[PDB]
Amino acid sequence: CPLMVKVLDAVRGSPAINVAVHVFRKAAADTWEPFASGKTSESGELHGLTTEEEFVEGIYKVEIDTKSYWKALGISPFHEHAEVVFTANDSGPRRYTIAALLSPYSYSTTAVVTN
Amino acid sequence: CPLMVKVLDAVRGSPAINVAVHVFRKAAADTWEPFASGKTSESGELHGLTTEEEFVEGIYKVEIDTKSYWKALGISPFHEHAEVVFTANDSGPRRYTIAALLSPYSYSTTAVVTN
Amino acid sequence: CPLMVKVLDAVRGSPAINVAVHVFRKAAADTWEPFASGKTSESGELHGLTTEEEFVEGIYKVEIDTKSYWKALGISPFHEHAEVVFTANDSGPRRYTIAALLSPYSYSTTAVVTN
Amino acid sequence: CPLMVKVLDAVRGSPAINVAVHVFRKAAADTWEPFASGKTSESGELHGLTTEEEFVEGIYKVEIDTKSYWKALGISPFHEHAEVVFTANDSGPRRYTIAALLSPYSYSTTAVVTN
């Protein structure tokens, strides 16, 4: 699993469940091509987005559909979504965990990159 | 001053100075149109991006060029930029402060919205 | 104004108003001595806690009463308070801004230190 | 495992390894009594601090020794430690994960409380 996404809810103190996540890869024509997507599990995690073979170096974007999550909870949010844009770089074996902590008017995101 | 951006550096405990910021507005053709740009000051703030007249209702994207900021400080960071996407002025004009707190592998963003 | 505290609410996207703040200084007998206190203003800021003369080198604790803030808004939060503990003025006088961003089950704190 | 602690490093994008963590329970004399402690693992986690039998309702404090972690890395930090203070409440079965994200001049903490 070279790429996983973990989302937490800072209002409820819980995993953020059933959040849609879309991953895009930047293409030569400077456009964003859909790459993978899914919904977070009961643990707020999304595994199995890609494989080591497919996840080559390049620029990627992870869009987390935060507005629809807060709307389901009946809480007015600020952002349309949270966008995490980064370059995947081969420098020995790597696993990328994109973590996001959500509040209605704020989010934080971190990358945990391990061997 | 209906739109202000404030950027802080969590490594040095200081304003993040000379950070480039680009603002876009979503146009009718589902494309991002350039709206305003600038660089943060010695206080880590960017004022004067727009006026109440020009800042109509719409979906806006504030792109903070964090990668160039870290690289100039000798750090190879994770993110290409911090992107903040939101609907503005949909219930009438508001004043928006978009704050971002930067670390090499993490950032947080917050909005302070006043009437 | 060598010590200022700023508190924001990540649920409402607003300053956190009327938040009680207590500052303590560690004394020679390994105890916390009361140093200053106050409440945040309409801008979520608390100024005038101390003077350059009184704010000597030492270990200080800034306790932000977040539980009372959330309870007054109808939320039963996780934390009793947000505690910020730090050594001040050990390399000469500095100006400190202690910022806190609050959510019911999370908070972040940052320091902006200037010469 | 009713209480675990997870610590991440926002400068390196990694788990924060070998961080000392001390847990205290508030006693009737309004003093903090040592309850449990340990060091985070290679995954930045600390498990096995307490048991369901011992972890009764009360006020607890989790101290994360952030200053010594940054000193080991040769980076000047702001805080002496990060302190997370909360009330444990029995309202059906609960597991508490205290997560902390560290930067030299900032930290965020979240509680993930699950059944």
Curated annotation (Swiss-Prot), chains A, B, C, D:
Outcome of substituting L49R: In AMYLD1; amyloid polyneuropathy
Substitution effect: T50K: In AMYLD1; amyloid cardiomyopathy
Effect after changing N115S: In AMYLD1; uncertain significance
Effect of V21L: In AMYLD1; amyloid polyneuropathy
Residue list for modification Sulfocysteine: C1
Outcome (variant: F78M): Loss of tetramerization
Impact when changing Y107V: Requires 2 nucleotide substitutions
Annotated effect of mutating A27P: In AMYLD1; amyloid polyneuropathy
Keyword Protease: no
Modified sites of kind 4-carboxyglutamate: E33
Record annotation: effect of changing L49H: In AMYLD1; amyloid polyneuropathy
Effect of substituting S41I: In AMYLD1; amyloid cardiomyopathy
Outcome, altering E45G: In AMYLD1; amyloid polyneuropathy
Modified residues annotated as Phosphoserine in this record: S43
Tissue specificity as recorded in UniProt: Detected in serum and cerebrospinal fluid (at protein level). Highly expressed in choroid plexus epithelial cells. Detected in retina pigment epithelium and liver.
Positions of glycan attachment: N89
Variant or mutagenesis effect after changing V21M: In AMYLD1; amyloid polyneuropathy; by far the most frequent mutation
Outcome of swapping V85A: In a patient with amyloidosis
Effect of I75S: In AMYLD1; amyloid polyneuropathy; almost no RBP binding
Maturation and modification: Not glycosylated under normal conditions. Following unfolding, caused for example by variant AMYLD1 'Gly-38', the cryptic Asn-89 site is exposed and glycosylated by STT3B-containing OST complex, leading to its degradation by the ER-associated degradation (ERAD) pathway. Sulfonation of the reactive cysteine Cys-1 enhances the stability of the native conformation of TTR, avoiding misassembly of the protein leading to amyloid formation.
Additional facts recorded: Tetramer dissociation and partial unfolding leads to the formation of aggregates and amyloid fibrils. Small molecules that occupy at least one of the thyroid hormone binding sites stabilize the tetramer, and thereby stabilize the native state and protect against misfolding and the formation of amyloid fibrils.
Domain-level remarks: Each monomer has two 4-stranded beta sheets and the shape of a prolate ellipsoid. Antiparallel beta-sheet interactions link monomers into dimers. A short loop from each monomer forms the main dimer-dimer interaction. These two pairs of loops separate the opposed, convex beta-sheets of the dimers to form an internal channel.
Entry similarity comment: Belongs to the transthyretin family.
Purpose of the protein: Thyroid hormone-binding protein. Probably transports thyroxine from the bloodstream to the brain.
Protein name as annotated: Transthyretin
Organism: Homo sapiens
Section of the entire sequence shown: 30 to 144 of 147
